[PDB]
Symmetry: C3
Amino acid sequence: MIIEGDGILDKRSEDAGYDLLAAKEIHLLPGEVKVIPTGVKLMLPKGYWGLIIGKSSIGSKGLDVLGGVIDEGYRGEIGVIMINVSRKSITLMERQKIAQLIILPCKHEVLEQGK
Amino acid sequence: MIIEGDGILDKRSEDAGYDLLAAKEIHLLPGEVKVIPTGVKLMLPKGYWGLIIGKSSIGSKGLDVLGGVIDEGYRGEIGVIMINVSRKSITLMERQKIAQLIILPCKHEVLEQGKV
Amino acid sequence: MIIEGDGILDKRSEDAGYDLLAAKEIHLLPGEVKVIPTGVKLMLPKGYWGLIIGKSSIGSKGLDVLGGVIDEGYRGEIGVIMINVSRKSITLMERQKIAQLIILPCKHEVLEQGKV
Ligand SMILES: O=c1ccn([C@H]2CC(O)[C@@H](COP(=O)(O)OP(=O)(O)OP(=O)(O)O)O2)c(=O)[nH]1
Ligand SMILES: O=c1ccn([C@H]2CC(O)[C@@H](COP(=O)(O)OP(=O)(O)OP(=O)(O)O)O2)c(=O)[nH]1
């Protein structure tokens, strides 16, 4: 798969997703929502989409990653929407692992107004 | 796919899911959970289920979608289980986009007890 | 597929996923995140992975069910991670339905630096 940036890591065959990395250091206040930049651009194979889903490691810190859909056509850089549901401030360091990207098949069917 | 209603917009070949519009106005308080009607019913093809995932514009506001699994065997009105995990109350408007539905493939297996 | 435990129930061919039950009774103090044990091990068919999607009703009950990805190679016990987002202690009881597990396809490729 074609990519652009160093904010994503290869994965073993047994692994379902690629690790996404924070492009820069981030500080999330309590309850704050932030779109964290990864510095990566993707060229997803034709017929697939990328699912952004959290990693148990940062989830265990009171950080909820809000499910992200990466479209096949999307050509900008990937961003991870994250919320600090905890009651204190949290810091994500540069290049720290923050989420995963999973490539799933996509089915395109036109819509019909039947019954 | 056969659909009924107008709370779901068609999509492009480069798109992953079909947007889902709020059938009515919704006001969620901080930490409140409400199911949001879409007024859309549909027939999922054979061998596929429908996954409801939020759109980045609502996600970026602290709204998250809970249990968005639409079963192959389900013909009722689709409803979006939205929770406001932000620190303040937000209002979603009528016909405002609220989530996406991505048709994914079903994988049926029989569960067999055994050593793993 | 091969399972080892009691925390999982078979499904209808029209059902997208298998229900997960709470292994033991769990106390979640306010603002506490806890890996809810299920007591089941899996042997996911080759090429697939397991998607854990929280059960709507327990997200209303003041709990948030985090990142649920079971890798093809994972041979341990399945746990469901959750955070207590309310002002009171919430006790999850044994054999309580806490989530769903859906087997989905997985694409594997080498990452190549190019231009998009
Ligand atoms: O977690 C996410 C979600 C989205 N994106 C990007 C990539 C992608 O496919 C594109 C479009 O997201 P989308 O169209 O859902 O969100 P929107 O802001 O609600 O869009 P609009 O009304 O134009 O559909 O946004 C991310 O990087 N991360
Ligand atoms: O809801 C979940 C999420 C993960 N797991 C397990 C099973 C599985 O495939 C393995 C790995 O989780 P993961 O690798 O995401 O978390 P991490 O702690 O951040 O790991 P690392 O960077 O080493 O991968 O963790 C569960 O049982 N339930």
